[PDB]
Design a protein around this nucleic acid. Structure first.
Length: 1301
RNA sequence: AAGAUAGCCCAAGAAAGAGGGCAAUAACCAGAUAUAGCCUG
């Protein structure tokens, strides 16, 4: 990358913008580059490549022969341009550079022929010498100097396709080089249209001296800008470049014409938009089908553009003729693909020149009146064709069809209109809707640009927006999951009442018969009202922990546990569509005293929980309680707010290598001296030490002052004295600490990891961070916790005897308790996070960390560049609440969500119900009597030899399995049954046999032989099965697949609002006919208010929880205002009743949405959105995850190609994160158009599936041994089978054929 | 309907041009919640 030293940004001063280069990290006054320094920086980066410049870049006999030819050409005395042009003590370097500039200038000024050196400051005699140096004869001699071999035309072809430098990979340059090489090797060859001197040699000189980048790159950076900027009259519009050159001025004029198109197209009169789309459609038909196409003959024919679109798509006409296939020879296929790309380019050039001519000659009403608008679209069309072939992955016949290309370009032009209206709405929503903020103003004005942004938008401004929108979208996913988990055990929904958050309180009656309950009254759906409180308290750790809590104090009067459930439902709902940007918000409808009291009650157990984890992790088995007490107070006296982008403990201390690293004398030298319980006690110790070090790592190590100082000195050792990398890594650390000496260790890690950072996850600075953190932690242990070096096995004390005086030394939650009591917003974060799975709560916490670090980094870079920035996005607060408080709240949920009660009665009604529930995942040979006795006999039966089954029983009762209860609270039972097989006796037999085989080398960590490593992996796989750990893995994968779908839902909903905002903002600001209430609402009710820019206010009100909407009520037929808390679906209906008077349209809500989507599928989009967010998949299983992702790819992101075309890759990445590699196959399925209430028709749909044979394979783990290295499948066939079932259910496939081994 | 594995902005450009930028835009990278599960780099 050219600008690898620096970063770019866009700054705006007084409605004028400038792209800048700046060094990072740096200080104000030393970061932003001035004009001259920007110019010399680019120039310096270009000249730093001249001496390594080579025409060619960089096992089989032929492939290895081609590499030897390239190397010999690139060697000394070969084609080394720096040696050739610096001859005679560099006396001719300036003349050669001047020649290269004149050669380029002659091209863009259309002067034929190579420049004469006499015009490069050189006499006629020297000119003859220089011309000879860069002649074909001399190039041939340099090429031949190190080669004494025979080649062919095909060999030269393969060398050019595989090794020619990218900057030289243009058709005429490649043909010039081929002609040169054939002449060099005395092979007969003819290419009469090509001149070796002008087409290859002269161009190589232009490329060697970088004459294009030298004269253009710096100016192109300075003229960069944002998508939207204010105009003179304080209106947002798409940004138009300033131009400055002949081609730049024409380009800006075309862009101004399209800006007028966006203004004129925003018309409620659909006939106006219909006519404009028809003219754009005729440009597409002209481009691909010529001026004599039948749809261009009659200028006044109002043909259906969409029916023409469908007709062309199935046309068999060929855009180019593809060459025949090759006799796979991958070198031959690359040559063929390059030939195919040139065929596309030549035909695309022909189509362009023909369309430009026909637009100028035979318009007369066919196209747009503005010629610059026709040219803008023709340039878009040519660019769209190039987008298709420039990154062609494989030559296919369908992609060579004219109808495929014309219709891809048609949707491409509509895409461009869609993203520009969305871009306009983005600027309007964030910067021109200030008076949405709750106020006492009786008259407000929407759509006026806030004062801080009238001078324009900077790139830092949009980085802040991204940070906020990312966290908002991530939080919307967990709101949905919290609602799902709360509903899963309390209510049973139906298809008509499938959104738990929209159920109504127990007193809600039917509107048309007040004698009956409302259909959505929560009473109609309760699974068991008499156990409702205990069912809810399962998610608060079990009701046994609440026997002292005065529920009746808060549920007094006629309130009961149904109001308890309703209050929790109301908390979660108040966070849905709760905008971080506009406060409507801090006074919840629910019982704030009850929720606050439950929070305080939960903080009171936190010290007990954290010290219990020391006990449960067997730390008091190897260390003195007094030494552990000291550590507990150190770690948990204060709530620790973790920073993002710090390497995780598990990456610094890999668990596999942990026993060996602990015993190493150079690290810690810990040896535990220990009968039958020997190997089991060593395993307990290393597991205990691993948990203790992890807690130390996060709660004491990372923030220690002495640790940071010694980290810096050690990391910069090699710098002040792999060896290549540690020197550069050390110098980077030195630069960081010089810029700011107060940077924390986390901030140094963040800055390093920044420059360390392709859309696809890759299958098979960071290490030096890991190594230096590892070394610093070991010394921190030796300096501050020396007692850990001397473990001693002794009997475990009683759980209640382990540091019972812990609470009296620490009070970490003292201040937070009162702040939650007075903050409805804090209570929202509490309840939403509290109802997540432990893994989800952890992810939510990580997203908060990434948000805080992002905002801090934006303001850091804005400050060093001297860029004034509005602080609407705070570094320390979110939605008016301290991020530190939100962090502590989510962290409490993370810990308590994973703390399962020890009482079976907290989750089940007796041991028999629990045993039967276990039978859904374990086949303990149920005879038919009672499940409890069947399980007890199973565990008491012989497994292998002298070993009983055991595992699942704890004395007189079945053993409480942590993974079983977590799947009950947070997982989906029917889903897990349908994708997995129950644990069997043979599983347990194989478990115990592998436990015995590995019992002698289990804690060796890193192993000697290949058979030892494979048997260890096999035992770990069997342990995961018998402990139901694979069950949790599948549940998390499903949660990640479902979470991404919900993420996409709120991505689309944001952009639908932005499209509507930008479109109606453009309509408000054009001269088209607009009715009174579209512009101004004058509401005269008791809550009177005058709304200027009413359409914009009402659009945003549809999407913001708490923003009231003005409408004419159904039953009263009079104007009213809502409280703003009604559902999105209710607000859409209300918006229709606000616009129902509109006389220039039948549907204001849908105006312009033909650009955003296919209107005929609008209700199908709503159905898919509801299907996902209401978790209908887990109740019906009518579609597969692959089928849901397929429909999203097919029609959920019609509004923006960059989201649609990444949908399959995102799915591929999620699976690869769990070490599953899948190979996609894109085929056909079915989808409905419309919803029956009875006009729905069926149509073809995109179907993403997996290749039938060898479509799924596991990633390989690289397992280092003592001497060698072995590769083992990360996931066995049984794991891959459940992944396939997860993706395909209810569809069944041949998994023996699909899985590759 | 689709056959994905980007998209946009600046520059260049008709004997085409094809040089730069993007935490701005999604993805990517990173994140450890619980007891042998995310190795390697």
């Amino acid at each position: 990358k050219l600008t690898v030293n620096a970063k770019t940004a866009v700054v705006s001063e007084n409605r004028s913008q400038e792209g800048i280069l700046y060094n990072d990290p740096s200080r104000y006054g030393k970061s932003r580059k001035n004009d001259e320094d920007r110019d010399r920086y680019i120039e310096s980066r270009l000249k730093s490549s001249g001496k390594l410049y080579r025409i060619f870049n960089e096992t089989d006999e032929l492939q290895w022969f081609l590499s030897e030819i390239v190397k010999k050409i690139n060697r000394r005395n070969g084609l080394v341009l720096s040696d050739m042009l610096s001859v005679d003590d560099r006396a001719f370097e300036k003349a050669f550079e001047k020649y290269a500039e004149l050669s380029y200038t002659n091209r863009r000024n259309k002067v034929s022929g190579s420049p004469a050196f006499e015009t490069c400051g050189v006499d006629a005699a020297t000119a003859e010498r220089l011309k000879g140096i860069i002649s074909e004869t001399n190039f041939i001699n340099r090429i031949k100097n190190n080669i004494d071999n025979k080649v062919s035309e095909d060999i030269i072809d393969r060398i050019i396709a595989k090794y020619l430098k990218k900057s030289l990979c243009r058709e005429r340059v490649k043909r010039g080089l081929k002609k040169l090489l054939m002449n060099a090797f005395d092979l007969p060859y003819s290419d009469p249209d090509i001149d070796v001197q002008r087409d290859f040699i002269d161009y190589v000189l232009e490329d060697f001296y970088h004459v294009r980048a030298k004269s253009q790159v710096s100016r192109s950076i300075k003229n960069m800008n944002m998508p939207v900027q204010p105009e003179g009259d304080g209106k947002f519009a798409i940004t138009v470049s300033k131009g400055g050159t002949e081609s730049g001025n024409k380009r800006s004029a075309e862009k101004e014409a399209f800006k007028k198109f966006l203004s004129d197209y925003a018309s409620l009169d659909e006939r106006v938009r219909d006519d404009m789309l028809r003219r754009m459609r005729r440009l597409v038909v002209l481009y691909f089908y010529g001026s004599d196409d039948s749809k261009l003959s009659d200028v006044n024919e109002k043909f259906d553009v969409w029916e023409d679109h469908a007709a062309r798509r199935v046309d068999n006409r060929e855009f180019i003729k593809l060459p025949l296939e090759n006799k796979t020879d991958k070198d031959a296929e690359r040559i063929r693909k390059n030939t195919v790309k040139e065929l596309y380019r030549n035909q695309n050039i022909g189509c362009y020149r023909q369309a430009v001519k026909a637009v100028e000659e035979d318009n007369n009403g066919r196209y747009f009146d503005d010629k610059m608008l026709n040219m803008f679209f023709i340039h878009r069309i040519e660019y769209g064709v190039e987008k298709i072939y420039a990154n062609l992955k494989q030559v296919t016949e369908f992609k060579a069809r004219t109808g495929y290309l014309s219709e891809k370009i048609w949707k491409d032009l509509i895409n461009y209109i869609s993203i520009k209206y969305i871009a306009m709405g983005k600027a309007v929503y964030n910067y021109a809707m200030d008076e949405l903020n709750a106020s006492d103003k009786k008259e407000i004005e929407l759509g006026k640009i806030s004062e801080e942004y009238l001078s324009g938008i900077s790139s830092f401004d949009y980085e802040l927006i991204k940070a906020e929108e990312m966290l908002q979208r991530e939080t919307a996913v967990y709101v949905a999951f919290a609602a799902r988990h709360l509903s899963s055990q309390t209510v049973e929904l139906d298809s008509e009442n499938s959104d738990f958050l929209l159920l109504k309180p127990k007193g809600t009656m039917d509107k048309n018969d007040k004698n009956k309950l409302a259909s959505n009254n929560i009473l109609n759906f309760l699974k068991d009202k008499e156990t409702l409180r205990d069912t809810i308290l399962q998610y608060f750790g079990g009701h046994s922990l609440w026997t002292d809590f005065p529920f009746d104090k808060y549920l007094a009067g006629g309130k009961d546990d149904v109001d308890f459930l309703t209050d929790l439902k109301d908390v979660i709902y108040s966070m849905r569509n709760d905008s971080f940007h506009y406060a409507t918000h801090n006074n919840g409808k629910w019982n704030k005293e009850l929720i606050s009291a439950m929070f305080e009650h939960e903080t009171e157990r936190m010290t007990v929980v954290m010290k219990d984890k020391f006990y449960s992790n067997n730390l008091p088995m190897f260390y003195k309680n007094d030494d552990l007490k000291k550590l507990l107070i150190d770690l948990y006296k204060d709530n620790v707010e973790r920073a993002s982008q710090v390497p995780s403990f598990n990456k610094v201390f890999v668990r596999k290598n942990f026993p060996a690293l602990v015993r190493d004398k150079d690290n810690l030298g810990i040896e535990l001296d220990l009968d039958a319980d020997k190997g089991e006690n060593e395993l307990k110790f290393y597991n205990a030490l691993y948990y203790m070090f992890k807690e130390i790592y996060y709660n004491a190590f990372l923030n220690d002052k002495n640790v940071r100082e010694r980290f810096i000195t050690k990391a910069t050792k090699v710098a002040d004295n792999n060896y290549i990398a540690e020197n550069d890594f050390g110098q980077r650390i030195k630069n960081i600490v010089q810029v700011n000496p107060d940077y924390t260790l986390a901030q140094i890690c963040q800055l390093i990891m920044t420059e360390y950072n392709c859309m696809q996850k890759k299958s098979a600075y960071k290490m030096l961070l890991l190594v230096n953190l590892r070394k610093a932690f070991l010394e921190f242990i030796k300096e501050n916790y020396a007692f850990v070096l001397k473990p001693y096995k002794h009997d475990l004390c009683d759980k209640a005897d382990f540091v019972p005086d812990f609470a009296k030394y620490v009070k970490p939650y003292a201040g937070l308790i009162s702040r939650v009591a007075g903050s409805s917003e804090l209570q929202k974060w509490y309840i939403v996070s509290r109802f997540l799975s432990p893994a989800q709560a952890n992810h939510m916490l990580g997203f908060l960390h990434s948000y805080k670090q992002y905002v801090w980094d934006i303001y850091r870079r804005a400050s060093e560049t001297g860029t004034e920035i509005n602080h609407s996005i705070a570094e320390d607060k979110i939605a008016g609440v301290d991020i530190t408080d939100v962090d502590a709240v989510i962290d409490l949920s993370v810990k308590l969500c994973g703390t399962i009660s020890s009482e079976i009665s907290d989750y089940f009604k007796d041991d028999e119900v629990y045993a039967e529930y276990i039978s859904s995942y374990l086949d303990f040979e149920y005879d038919g009597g009672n499940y409890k006795d069947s399980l007890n006999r199973f565990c008491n039966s012989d497994a292998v030899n002298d070993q009983k089954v055991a595992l699942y029983y704890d004395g007189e009762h079945p053993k409480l399995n942590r993974n079983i209860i977590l799947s009950k609270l947070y997982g989906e039972r029917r889903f897990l049954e349908k994708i997995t097989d129950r644990v069997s006796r043979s599983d347990i037999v194989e478990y115990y046999k592998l436990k015995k085989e590995t019992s002698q080398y289990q804690t060796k960590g890193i192993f000697d032989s290949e058979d030892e490593q494979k048997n260890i992996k096999k035992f770990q796989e069997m342990k995961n099965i018998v402990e139901f750990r694979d069950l949790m893995d599948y549940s998390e994968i499903a949660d990640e697949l479902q979470g991404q779908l919900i993420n996409w839902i709120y991505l689309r909903e944001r952009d639908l609002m932005n499209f509507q905002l930008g479109y109606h903002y453009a309509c408000l600001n054009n001269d088209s006919n607009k009715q009174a209430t579209y512009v101004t609402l004058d509401y005269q009710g008791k809550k009177n208010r005058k709304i200027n820019g009413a359409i914009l206010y009402q659009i945003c009100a549809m999407y913001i929880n708490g923003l009231p909407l003005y409408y004419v009520d159904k039953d009263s037929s009079e104007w009213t205002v809502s409280d703003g808390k009604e559902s999105t679906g209710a607000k859409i209906g209300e918006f229709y009743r606000y616009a129902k008077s509109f006389e220039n349209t039948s549907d204001c809500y849908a105006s312009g949405l033909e650009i955003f989507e296919n209107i005929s599928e609008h209700d199908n989009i709503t159905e898919l959105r509801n299907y996902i967010e209401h978790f209908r998949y887990y109740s019906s299983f009518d579609r597969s995850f692959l089928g849901i992702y397929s429909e999203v790819f097919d029609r959920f992101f019609t509004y923006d190609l960059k989201y649609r075309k990444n949908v399959p890759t995102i799915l591929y990445n999620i699976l690869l994160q769990h070490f599953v590699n899948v190979r996609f196959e894109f085929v056909s399925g079915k989808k409905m158009i419309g919803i029956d209430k009875k006009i729905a028709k069926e149509k073809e749909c995109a179907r993403i599936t997996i290749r039938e044979k060898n479509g799924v394979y596991s990633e390989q783990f690289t397992y280092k041994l003592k001497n060698g290295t072995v590769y083992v499948d990360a996931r066995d066939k049984r794991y891959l089978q459940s992944i396939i079932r997860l993706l395909f259910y209810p569809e069944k496939v041949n998994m023996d054929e699909m899985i590759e081994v």
